[PDB]
Amino acid sequence: TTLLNPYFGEFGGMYVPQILMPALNQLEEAFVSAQKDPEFQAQFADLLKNYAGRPTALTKCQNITAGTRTTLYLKREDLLHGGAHKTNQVLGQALLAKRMGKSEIIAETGAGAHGVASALASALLGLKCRIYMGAKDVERQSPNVFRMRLMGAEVIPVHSGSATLKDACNEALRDWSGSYETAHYMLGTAAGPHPYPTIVREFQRMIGEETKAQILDKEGRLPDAVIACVGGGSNAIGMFADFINDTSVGLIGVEPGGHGIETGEHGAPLKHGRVGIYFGMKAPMMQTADGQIEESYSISAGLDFPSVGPQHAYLNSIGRADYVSITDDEALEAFKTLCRHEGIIPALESSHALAHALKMMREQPEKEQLLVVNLSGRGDKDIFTVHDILKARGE
Amino acid sequence: TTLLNPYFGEFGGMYVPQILMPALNQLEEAFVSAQKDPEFQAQFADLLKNYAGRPTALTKCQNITAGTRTTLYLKREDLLHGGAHKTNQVLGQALLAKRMGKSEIIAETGAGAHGVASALASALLGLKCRIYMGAKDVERQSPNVFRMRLMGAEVIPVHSGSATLKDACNEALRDWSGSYETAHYMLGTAAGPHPYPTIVREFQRMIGEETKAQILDKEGRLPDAVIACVGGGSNAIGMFADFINDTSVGLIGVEPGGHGIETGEHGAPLKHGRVGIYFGMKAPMMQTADGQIEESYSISAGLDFPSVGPQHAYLNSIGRADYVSITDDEALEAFKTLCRHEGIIPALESSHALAHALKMMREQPEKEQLLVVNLSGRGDKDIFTVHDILKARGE
Amino acid sequence: MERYENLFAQLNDRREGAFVPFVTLGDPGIEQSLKIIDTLIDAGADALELGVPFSDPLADGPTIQNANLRAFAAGVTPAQCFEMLALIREKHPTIPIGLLMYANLVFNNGIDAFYARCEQVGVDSVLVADVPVEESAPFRQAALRHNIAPIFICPPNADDDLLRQVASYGRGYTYLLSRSGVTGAENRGALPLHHLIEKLKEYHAAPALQGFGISSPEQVSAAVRAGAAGAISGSAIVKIIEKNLASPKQMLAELRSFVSAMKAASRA
Amino acid sequence: MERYENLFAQLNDRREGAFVPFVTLGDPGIEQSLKIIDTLIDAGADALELGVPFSDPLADGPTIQNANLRAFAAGVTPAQCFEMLALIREKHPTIPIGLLMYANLVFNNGIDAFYARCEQVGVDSVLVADVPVEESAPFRQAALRHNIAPIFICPPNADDDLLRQVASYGRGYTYLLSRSGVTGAENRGALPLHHLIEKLKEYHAAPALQGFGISSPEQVSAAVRAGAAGAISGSAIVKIIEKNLASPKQMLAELRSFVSAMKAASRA
Ligand SMILES: O=P(O)(O)OCCNS(=O)(=O)c1ccc(OC(F)(F)F)cc1
Ligand SMILES: O=P(O)(O)OCCNS(=O)(=O)c1ccc(OC(F)(F)F)cc1
Ligand SMILES: *Cc1c(COP(=O)(O)O)cnc(C)c1O
Ligand SMILES: *Cc1c(COP(=O)(O)O)cnc(C)c1O
Ligand SMILES: [Cl-]
Ligand SMILES: [Cl-]
Ligand SMILES: [Cs+]
Ligand SMILES: [Cs+]
Ligand SMILES: [Cs+]
Ligand SMILES: [Cs+]
Ligand SMILES: [Cs+]
Ligand SMILES: [Cs+]
Ligand SMILES: [Cs+]
Ligand SMILES: [Cs+]
């Protein structure tokens, strides 16, 4: 039995080996307790404000919308300590590990953003941190690997399966299957087995809460739509949550279209995959015809999770949220546009959200619309990728 | 004649060719006017808050001071948009250029931080930006050069003199000598000819103002000392200004000791150079015995300005502020310490300030002292430098 | 499931435990895997546990992770595994054949259709490693509709409620986990299981087979002495495959020697 | 300063403008620089402007930036330049010798001592390029104490106050800037200067020499026609050095030809 519903409609659940069920039940209890504990909430708020820098700015971008009827704000998760929204929820989960009496952290990472986020939270809070990373990601993300090691974390390359993110996800679960009495598994997105999709949403929901307050203050009304990129779903559900009951507010999630949906080289399972069961949940996923799990392709390494959180699949099924895709080339035009016209270098992940807002504007430039893009991170990490594309293209 | 005193005691002045005097007089008038203009102050405050992210956090660092009587806070200029405090004053100067009816910006840069800051402010405010950079700095700072170009700025390599920062400083002045009717020279530190040391201080003083408010709120008293690294002097004077009249508050500036003061390979002119006249000011500088200007050496490329702002030289001479140095190795131990024990990767510039606070603590661990370090920027940019040292050292 | 009922009744008459090896289907290729499996049977295996290669075997340690990888290197698909299973049953009338599955391979083309195919090829049980009792309903229901035993895991710290659920829902055998963690011969269980064994019998559970870390004759005899109906060994068997890839004949010789020794340990 | 007073009186008697070349001392080496300077004089230079190599010549365009760099490549120091200056004066009794300095080289070992050394070697004027009138007091005072003319810059947009200051404080000649920007033959001044020339005379200023971008005979004649006492040419001269580094004899030939042509333009 559980305290909370492990499903969002038919999506979600707890598809872990039996041995891990007491670990999920323990975590769910500790979370429900923490959410009622004003000492826990105060400690979390203190870390978010004085260590991470919350609240984050809401920036009105005038140059990029000039001569249209679109008003565009960017919620600046790029300004959070660590340079991405991931920092919010790792601080909450590290506090949950402490609450349960654990002093060790296990984390998975693909391109390394969540590994770095886990390592910083662990360094701050005095927790011993070990991070699993597919050997192919290790080889291509030396900067993030070195950041994790500077912060005192152990980075363990994973050589099994495809040696990428899904294989690190398995390895973290394997370890936790034996170590959960002393270690907490700090899952990096709003996916996996219950209670993680719920915990990660609640520890990211300050994004949407602040956005609502900031847009009431600046515009005197709610946005027409809030727009976020979707890897596993954490930044998007963090932006969406506080607006779900505001039925006039559009919720738009943007999956990576990669080389184009029709090529099969993409990362858009919610709209172009097939429901399956993997990583502890029933959810849309990238898989072969006979049920083997596949990689998510995108120009943006941070959009590599090969499935999507179950709350997104549910919000889609009921028509509360709408999901779209943006290709590598659209993302890369949005990246260049924000740099040149606003002086902000966006993460290539976030550039997918911005590319979709730019399309909403350009397609219907006389439509009055008040839009917020969740700028989930900064793009310093991406300037080599972008340089190399532009060079190979002859720009 | 001028509206404000161009000197701080015997330091400072306006040592520019006659042709540039009307440009300095114009800028001084526009600044004095802007400081009385509540529309200008409101526009500046709006950019600082909603675009740059002010106020910045003040973080209490508990792990690094455990078991001593030091309480250490870090003022988090690393969280500002752009990743360093430079963003504050470039936004103010870009508003001054607009106030004067100029739509073009000229800037100098060494390691590229000020070039990137100038380029982002210019992109935001629709100004055409050209940036001079010594050819040797261009070659070694490809990431920052590409950032400036993504933001629509022109980067012009300078091949004259030593092909480094001082030579870019000359080139910017050469250009301005002909273009000042349409272009503003956005000088990158609290140095050069009046009115720049005054303007840059006033457009950085929110650092110390916020720090004072934040420390009154958290501790109910003023700090025992505020500590900042000193390249040209902007982050340090920004932290110091609001505390100058609080005579119980120590003001400690940290120059780069490089390989050691005794080696001559350093960047500490305030304490180990010789007063001269260069870059429009009378100030301590790195120079040969017969008066040729020399380079400032530090492990940190951002501490390469070969002189120091005149207000620092003055505050030193009257004993209001104290200046010390920190070597490459001390800076690099402070960098590793903050990463491992607080999960914050500091700029190697800022690491010099932190290294000095760590020394204040370690030398006298039973001394009760409340210290603030100005964490002038983040250190993502430095992880290759640090990696390479640690490898060559065999760590 | 009836094949397990008959096997355990016959073993009880022979005062004997069951010895049950695990291998990955198609490791290191289809033809060699078929010969491996016939060798395990000829050498004394009482039942088989057979894994379908899956991209994400999250209850398995490195030995079996690598077996999955070898089968994939040989192009082994679930369809080819079902062809293998039909052939194995066509050769061997009474040996219970259990599959070790991961949920996505069962759900992929419909849970009911999966169990219908198992019944068609003559499989006797299915253990879905990432489906805990809480999520088991559509799996156990489909299993029973198609005369397949759903195999439930009893962890070494199972409380009374869990014991009662596993006892009620399971058929064929109860999987008695030696320890926490994942499969592997490098980690032996150190917890006494005889209390769990006794409670499972009290609740009329399917007979218990101890599994995880069983690599030696003395562990087989210990499982029987503790009151279990037998023991499962995976990694130790797969190790022999991995060691002997270059020599298929030596591989079969060593598999025969190992299985013979392990089976001998169950009699006494 | 008296050498300028005598020169301008003699030129006024000859109905002639002054032609004044600039070169960097020690470019491209000490010995060649000495020969260059003697050639400029023999070819008709009325006075000289001589630069001491400085690391940061911020009023100079690329041509003279590169002259500084050549002198540094030859190891030229300010001490060697003062040795050169003493030798130049020992050869030539009456030609006015003006230095083009940057402030740090003047301040370095004491402003008074700098001007005392100038007087010892027989220099007649000093122009400090990065000291505007507002900062000029200790420089002009030291100059006058040591019988050195302090040279002030009159920009092409000088207002009445600036004209009055430059007129009062200056001696020797008034430097009449052709245009904004920095030294260089690639940019010719396009602003009429005759109003400034007239006001400087009204205020009893030192006679005006037009400088910046003067590269052709017609500009020398234009300066004289506008009422200036003569013209200074730097970059055009230094260009000839730069072009002919590989052939010191052709360099001197071309310098002689150029200076002769430029001087001829001042007579008429
Ligand atoms: O001898 P070892 O240690 O390799 O163990 C062999 C086990 N192979 S198996 O098919 O029984 C088997 C049984 C259960 C498993 O996981 C679960 F418990 F979560 F369901 C995994 C494999
Ligand atoms: O012919 P060009 O264009 O090279 O000009 C030659 C000038 N050489 S100089 O010594 O008179 C000279 C005079 C003044 C200078 O700068 C100042 F105006 F700021 F003071 C620089 C050089
Ligand atoms: C990790 C990451 C994402 C995608 O993960 P979500 O869980 O979908 O938010 C998006 N943007 C940035 C900057 C990231 O670091
Ligand atoms: C530029 C820079 C400095 C040094 O410049 P100051 O003008 O002395 O502040 C210090 N820290 C950081 C992070 C910088 O970017
Ligand atoms: Cl509210
Ligand atoms: Cl106040
Ligand atoms: Cs359900
Ligand atoms: Cs608009
Ligand atoms: Cs995805
Ligand atoms: Cs003074
Ligand atoms: Cs302390
Ligand atoms: Cs310095
Ligand atoms: Cs049963
Ligand atoms: Cs005079």
PDB file of N, CA, C and O in Angstrom, chain C residues 17 141 158 179 214:
ATOM      1  N   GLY C  17      16.316 -32.407  -3.044  1.00  0.00           N
ATOM      2  CA  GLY C  17      16.085 -31.017  -3.473  1.00  0.00           C
ATOM      3  C   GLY C  17      16.165 -30.894  -4.989  1.00  0.00           C
ATOM      4  O   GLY C  17      16.766 -31.738  -5.664  1.00  0.00           O
ATOM      5  N   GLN C 141      -2.769 -12.627 -13.441  1.00  0.00           N
ATOM      6  CA  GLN C 141      -4.056 -13.034 -14.039  1.00  0.00           C
ATOM      7  C   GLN C 141      -3.831 -13.647 -15.409  1.00  0.00           C
ATOM      8  O   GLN C 141      -4.374 -14.734 -15.704  1.00  0.00           O
ATOM      9  N   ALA C 158      10.918 -10.234   4.448  1.00  0.00           N
ATOM     10  CA  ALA C 158       9.480 -10.147   4.148  1.00  0.00           C
ATOM     11  C   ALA C 158       8.699 -10.121   5.444  1.00  0.00           C
ATOM     12  O   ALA C 158       8.948 -10.947   6.341  1.00  0.00           O
ATOM     13  N   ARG C 179      19.422 -12.628  -0.453  1.00  0.00           N
ATOM     14  CA  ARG C 179      19.946 -11.350   0.044  1.00  0.00           C
ATOM     15  C   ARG C 179      19.381 -10.204  -0.789  1.00  0.00           C
ATOM     16  O   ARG C 179      18.753 -10.428  -1.834  1.00  0.00           O
ATOM     17  N   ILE C 214      24.144 -18.430  -5.239  1.00  0.00           N
ATOM     18  CA  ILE C 214      24.366 -19.869  -5.043  1.00  0.00           C
ATOM     19  C   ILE C 214      25.397 -20.336  -6.073  1.00  0.00           C
ATOM     20  O   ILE C 214      25.111 -20.347  -7.291  1.00  0.00           O
TER      21      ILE C 214
END
